[PDB]
From Swiss-Prot, chain A:
Expressed in most tissues, with highest levels in lung, followed by heart, kidney, brain and liver. Predominantly expressed in endothelial cells. Also found in smooth muscle cells of the uterus, neurons, and brown adipose tissue. High expression in embryonic choroid plexus and kidney glomeruli. Residues 51-113, 165-235 form the PAS domain. This is Endothelial PAS domain-containing protein 1. Changing N136D: Decreases HRE DNA binding. Residues 123-144 are annotated as: Required for heterodimer formation with ARNT. Residues 239-282 form the PAC domain.
Curated annotation (Swiss-Prot), chain B:
Residues 221-261 form the PAC domain. This is Aryl hydrocarbon receptor nuclear translocator. It comes from Mus musculus. Changing L51D: Does not affect transcription factor activity. Changing L35E: Impairs heterodimer formation with EPAS1. Impairs heterodimer formation with HIF1A. Significantly destabilizes ARNT?s heterodimeric interactions with both NPAS1 and NPAS3. Compromises SIM1:ARNT heterodimer stability. Residues 15-55 are annotated as: Required for heterodimer formation with HIF1A.
Amino acid sequence: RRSKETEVFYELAHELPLPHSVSSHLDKASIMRLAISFLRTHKLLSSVCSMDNLYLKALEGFIAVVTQDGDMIFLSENISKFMGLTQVELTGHSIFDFTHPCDHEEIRENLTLVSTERDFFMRMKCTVTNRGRTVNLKSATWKVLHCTGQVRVLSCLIIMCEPIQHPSHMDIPLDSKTFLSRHSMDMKFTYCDDRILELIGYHPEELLGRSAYEFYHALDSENMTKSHQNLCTKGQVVSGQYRMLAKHGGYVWLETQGTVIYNPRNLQPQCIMCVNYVLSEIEKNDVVFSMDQTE
Amino acid sequence: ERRRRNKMTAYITELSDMVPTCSALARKPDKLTILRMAVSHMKSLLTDQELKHLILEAADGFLFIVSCETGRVVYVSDSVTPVLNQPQSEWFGSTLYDQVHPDDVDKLREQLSTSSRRSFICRMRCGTPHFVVVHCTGYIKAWKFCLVAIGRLQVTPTEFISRHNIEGIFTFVDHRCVATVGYQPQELLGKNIVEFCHPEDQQLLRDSFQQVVKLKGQVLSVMFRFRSKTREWLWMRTSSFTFQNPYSDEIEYIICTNTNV
């Protein structure tokens, strides 16, 4: 009977790996999807292996495993923290139902096929506001997530999705070996902070108006173009490791986060703000690579 | 709705297919049962260790905790072994400074100061002196203090390479020029490629240059005699293409590959 089913549904919800609290509020469709996915999940894991609150809190992102056809069969608990959307709300649904259509094709091909490794950026819906608060699903913003993992045998894609911290909104501490820069959309320097001098030897005045591409080691230029286009197309990007030519010979290793900055009043793309992570001291200090170094 | 009930069933069906004690059954039990055979079946049974396992799969990450005041490692997960080729025994009880590049020591010192969220990038040693780039994410938890963090990994002469402005001027050369043409980078930089070409070949070189620009983006190869540091005329093939700005499609520079023939 209805009564008699409503009893076991509750029995099922509370024995879901969930708080009695949240377990208690599920409609029945969800209890299915969450239970199902828990078993689905449990089946992938035994295939791989043969204080979670810590792990969950050390994460700067959430974990997802997604089937070759797009179903999100598991999503780690702390995603709500990043996307607003909770584990319960999404589990068992199609990834494509929550990602920018302009990326669906891309996602599809990352879901598919013989290297197993996967690394890409994806725009996913976020309903938590910069600084705490929350919005409705219609009032969703697009959030870029950096995804890294492996495609693995029915296939699965097992990825980590990290948000890229917004330069105007920083929860997180910065050390010495980091400097800021601003660019036009073609990545020409439009600003560079005084720390660059100490870090690489350039004066901002020497960099202003100068295209970023001429300070890249050339072996890297093609690869950075990809970062640029990603940044533009999706709004944020993380570059690979790259060498930047230093004022007096040699180069430094870098990793850069870039964000397109918008005018909140006229909604124009105003500029690119870059957080540049310097990964080394100057290497091949002896070798002069470019004309600028002459100065 | 119609398909409402159908998908509960597909769910239900799915459930029994997946509850072995229910699945191994002669025929399919009812709604109320499967509902209470799954309950019993998980009341048997994400794993605590598994969340950790997924990280390794996904992010090639491993966990570690270090005392903040000293940097003493109060714990390292064993995943340091698959991640770093490093024994927990090599890692547990130690100092993070022992584990990073001497140049990451400073950067490391600033991360562990009394203050929150922490996050950084550094080079760590792996052993059988080799370093790898590791992204560290984590937070400060008292333990006078400890750092809870995850380190994860990242995804990745016959000739010499040059970049030019569209005029033929050298604006960038790799150290192999010395090997290829005997010149110090300084000796090539700032001078026109034309200035290094044999008179009888110079228009082809210019021809080449007018063409690769005009035939934007694409490669064109051209062969000419280059004057070594020792002045002897060297046969060379360079294949080159124009490089355009991804945003503006302005030509950033010409990229050349210059191969000793």
